[PDB]
């Protein structure tokens, strides 16, 4: 390898570097419009950030609860599936369910209207579930696929498995400890 | 012995020996670290290099090569601990003048 490399004072032209770089890789062998050479647009390889899957192409901020319900109501009239986490005990009694002040889940409630979701002015979203007001906040937003399926075992050995729709957003309901303590201090 | 409660006496450490080397006091260092600590006369045979007693080397069975020699007791203790370990120190004595 010749070691004594030679240099000159002249200044490199910008476009000359640009067009040399251009000519080094703009060459394309895409002429093979054939089956093997073809590629399926809906099964591209997964770039790692799951919101950012598209590395090759044919050519984000975080929402809040009032913005999510504003879009789901006014922007589109299409129904949508949410997934909300409730606190461990709901402020109710199990009706004639053979008791001890245990947990009161949704499995111990009956059907019907069970509460009123009050969106206040300026972002505050409360879930009035009686006299007490639960608070609703946007949970950790999932980006991977969440399918909401049904499993019905109508026969002893066989049954029906049915998908109801894709779950996009997650809510979290949490009590208002500031209000619960400001009712009666301790 | 060691401490005050045993009426023990002080310690010429490893640093005061260096300071006495620095003055060049040879006989003071000899007197401190031999004569006022543990003085002991051995008799060393000049032919076999082993220690003896009373002008008599038991090893060679002779009296015609032994020498009187002032030595610290810690050194004699070292030499007999080494001869018990079968590491033999053979003291080759030269001469004066």
């Amino acid at each position: 390898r010749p070691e004594v490399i030679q240099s000159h004072s002249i200044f490199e032209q910008g476009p000359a570097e640009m067009m040399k770089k251009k000519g080094n890789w703009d060459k394309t062998v895409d002429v093979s419009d054939m089956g093997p050479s073809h590629i399926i647009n809906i099964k591209k390889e997964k770039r790692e950030t799951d919101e950012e899957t598209k590395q090759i192409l044919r050519m984000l901020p975080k929402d809040v609860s009032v913005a999510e319900l504003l879009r789901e109501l006014s922007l589109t009239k299409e129904e949508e599936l949410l997934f909300l986490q409730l606190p461990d005990t709901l402020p109710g009694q199990p009706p004639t369910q053979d008791i001890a002040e245990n947990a009161c889940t949704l499995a111990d409630l009956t059907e019907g209207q069970v509460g009123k979701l009050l969106i206040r002015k300026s972002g505050r979203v409360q879930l009035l579930l009686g006299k007490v007001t639960l608070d609703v906040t946007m949970g950790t937003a999932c980006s991977f696929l969440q399918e909401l399926v049904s499993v019905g075992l109508g026969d002893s050995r066989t049954g029906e498995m049915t998908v109801l729709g894709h779950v996009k957003h997650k809510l979290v309901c949490s009590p208002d400890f500031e209000s619960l303590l400001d009712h009666k201090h301790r | 012995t060691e401490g005050r409660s045993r009426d023990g006496g002080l310690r010429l450490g490893e640093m005061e020996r260096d300071c006495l080397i620095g003055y060049g006091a040879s006989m003071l260092l000899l007197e401190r670290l031999m004569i006022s600590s543990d003085a002991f006369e051995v008799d060393v045979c000049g032919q076999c290099g082993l220690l003896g007693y009373s002008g008599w080397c038991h090893y060679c069975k002779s009296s015609c090569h032994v020498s009187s020699l002032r030595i610290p007791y810690a050194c004699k203790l070292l030499f007999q601990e080494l001869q018990s370990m079968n590491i033999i120190p053979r003291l080759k004595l030269s001469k004066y003048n």
Partner: protein, 209 residues
């Protein structure tokens, strides 16, 4: 490049001129004060001038002892000099019937050729210098005092004044860079004149071992 390479080929040559002036070899005075612009005359840039066979020296003879005692200076071309290249220089030397030679390598030498240079011959000695070492004269440094090789008749007077043997002097290794500079061997005594803080001078001596 091609100004820095001719700068190196000037500086290595000037260093070898002062090294041959120090060892007792007949150096013409014009080669010691050779400016770069005068070096441009008989030697040029990369395509015209060539290192390995055009910048050599065999003119150097020890004018003190005998003009048949002579010494080569070669500038080998490949960075890692091969054993066959050493045999080429050795057969050139054998045909020319001289005993001393230098080798100015560029990046080093393979360890096989270095093991060769020890066991080629006691009569055929060659000295590996890296060219990165020769780009400054280590004798003209401010930390290296003036060394002087002594004659046997002065080493005998030294050993008779202090009433010594040879093996009681301080040592200096044979692989020492200034020992490689002066070309001294095992058994010789060098004088060192250490510069003082006052205007005096102190003298010491070192045996090569």
């Amino acid at each position: 490049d091609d100004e820095e390479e001719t700068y190196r080929l000037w500086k290595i040559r000037k260093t070898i001129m002062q090294l041959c002036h120090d060892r007792g070899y007949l150096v013409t005075q014009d080669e010691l004060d050779q400016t770069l612009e005068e070096f441009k005359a008989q030697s040029g840039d990369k395509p015209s001038e060539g290192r390995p066979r055009r910048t050599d020296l065999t003119v150097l003879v020890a004018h003190n002892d005998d003009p048949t005692d002579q010494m080569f200076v070669f500038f080998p071309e490949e960075p890692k000099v091969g054993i066959k290249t050493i045999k080429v220089y050795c057969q050139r030397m054998q045909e020319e019937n001289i005993t001393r030679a230098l080798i100015v390598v560029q990046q080093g030498m393979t360890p096989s050729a270095k093991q060769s240079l020890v066991d080629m011959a006691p009569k055929y000695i060659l000295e590996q210098f890296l060219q990165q070492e020769l780009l400054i004269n280590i004798t003209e440094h401010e930390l290296v005092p003036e060394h002087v090789v002594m004659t046997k008749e002065e080493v005998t007077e030294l050993l008779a004044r202090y009433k010594l043997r040879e093996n009681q002097l301080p040592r200096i290794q044979a692989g020492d860079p200034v020992a490689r500079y002066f070309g001294i061997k095992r058994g010789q005594v060098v004088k060192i004149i250490r510069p003082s803080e006052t205007a005096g001078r102190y003298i010491t001596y070192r045996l090569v071992q």
